[PDB]
Design a protein around this ligand. Sequence first.
Ligand SMILES: O=C(O)CC[C@]1(C(=O)O)N[C@H](C(=O)O)Cc2c1[nH]c1ccccc21
Ligand SMILES: O=C(O)CC[C@]1(C(=O)O)N[C@H](C(=O)O)Cc2c1[nH]c1ccccc21
Lengths: 286, 287
Amino acid sequence: ALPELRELIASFVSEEPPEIRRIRTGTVPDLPGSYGQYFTAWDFSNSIVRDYAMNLYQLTRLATDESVSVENLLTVFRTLDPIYSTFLGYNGFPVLAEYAQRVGQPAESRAELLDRLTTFTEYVNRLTAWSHHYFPWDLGGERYRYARIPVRLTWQPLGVQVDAEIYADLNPQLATDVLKALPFTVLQDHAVVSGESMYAWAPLVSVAPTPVRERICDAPVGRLRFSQATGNKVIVQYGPTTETLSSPVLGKVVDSHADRLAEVGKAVWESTFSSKEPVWLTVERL
Amino acid sequence: SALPELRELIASFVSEEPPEIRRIRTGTVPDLGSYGQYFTAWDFSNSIVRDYAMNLYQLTRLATDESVSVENLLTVFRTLDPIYSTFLGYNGFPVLAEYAQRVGQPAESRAELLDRLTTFTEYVNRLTAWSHHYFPWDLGGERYRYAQRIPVRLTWQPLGVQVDAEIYADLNPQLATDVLKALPFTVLQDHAVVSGESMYAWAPLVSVAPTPVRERICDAPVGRLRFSQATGNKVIVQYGPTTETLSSPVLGKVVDSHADRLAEVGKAVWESTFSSKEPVWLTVERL
Ligand SMILES: O=C(O)CC[C@]1(C(=O)O)N[C@H](C(=O)O)Cc2c1[nH]c1ccccc21
Ligand SMILES: O=C(O)CC[C@]1(C(=O)O)N[C@H](C(=O)O)Cc2c1[nH]c1ccccc21
């Protein structure tokens, strides 16, 4: 459907998109940002592309709902998309805006529209992944400070390796979807709002049901969860949190390897919040 | 009114800062880990409530499209809303997430659903308005530097600056009628933080009017009045240049003999939104 987006998705799994490089260095054409700075444009670029990616996934889900006609889906997309994609096109993402218009073109079938949305969502998810990695989350930390399928996870250049287990029965189609994407190597980043957890944008768009979920605060060390709605992310719980929402249970790092995760979470913290030195997560079947 | 408490909160929040915004911007959201800082949660709260409001208006626009059934719309809302509202409910806006659920309930007619969406949209619009005013836009200021004719009156306090203006009632007729029906109002005046020298103020209405007559922003004269429904139903005042080649509905113009009075306001308004956060209040009234 969108063969060029497929090539860019394959490239950006290991290479920084030039869109993200220009935004974070303040070299976007036509210089966005009032009065000689580009932080405000950087703030809008990072957050809008993220929330745009959230809309695109929920629209992909809507494309699977057969109670809504294909013509209605296109009507919903043509109304909700432009205010986001037009701004993103003039603020660092011209290719994004290009294929946003193309996704909204008339579709011959629900399968074609779903194929556009699924491919376009993964492409925007990867732009969000890189944008999240390079956004200066510690900029305000100075003056806003408070008072059983076996698999293998590897973090480089840390060199840490752990064995894990995918639960293929709890969320069957979800586990199947993640297992189908193996092996992959993507950037490993940290949560920036809440919890001692890290997530990595995995190369897939799963619309599987998630009947089996577990409260985050009760998630054990080494818990493998997955978040479709925030970008199809593999999440590793390495420490405590008080958030009471529930996340789909994907798997668990084995008991004898779970104590190895604390040093990963600390380094992944340092990279997401400060140094921006890449940490690469590899997930593979054993 | 479908959600009358929201209407009450609308009336209050035009003049008073919502307690949620003050709690977020001071890091005092109760029981809210953020690793010994509250900037990141502030960053997500501000941007997500703004983009949530952007989705809600497009859903309000969809509510006037009779080719999409009311049942297909409620299906659309029930799928798109929770990822936004549940996050906002746990990060400072419990009342917003509480009423987001009531928006998605079964509706007896299209008019009842549109009334829910329009009211909820204006409520989240005012939350976004205050969050925009108080967000620390100067945080990266140092680190990331580059190398017929309807007569109306606009007054900015505490400056006391005053300009007469004309509303172009025959170009975007339904938009002009919607804006004129909201007069008089007094709202917070804030500055654009991305696209240069314009200032906008979230106006107390949700217009679903068509916007046929648009003019390139780079071509708008000093004193041009424009209006943006999709970014929060904002009255926009042009006072400086811009290279934006984008479209914006033409609403009116500050009269020629008063255009010199806008530079000092735009300078003072920028000082507020960007660093000082001292409120500048805009009153728009008929003449
Ligand atoms: O943090 C929360 O309150 C919710 C949990 C959450 C996650 O599932 O990863 N945390 C992320 C982070 O910390 O970066 C941000 C985030 C989460 N859900 C979200 C839903 C919508 C937008 C953003 C988020
Ligand atoms: O900035 C741009 O590139 C577009 C012009 C714009 C405006 O309509 O006022 N500027 C605003 C600002 O600077 O705060 C941000 C903004 C604008 N459209 C938008 C559309 C969607 C989201 C955000 C914006």
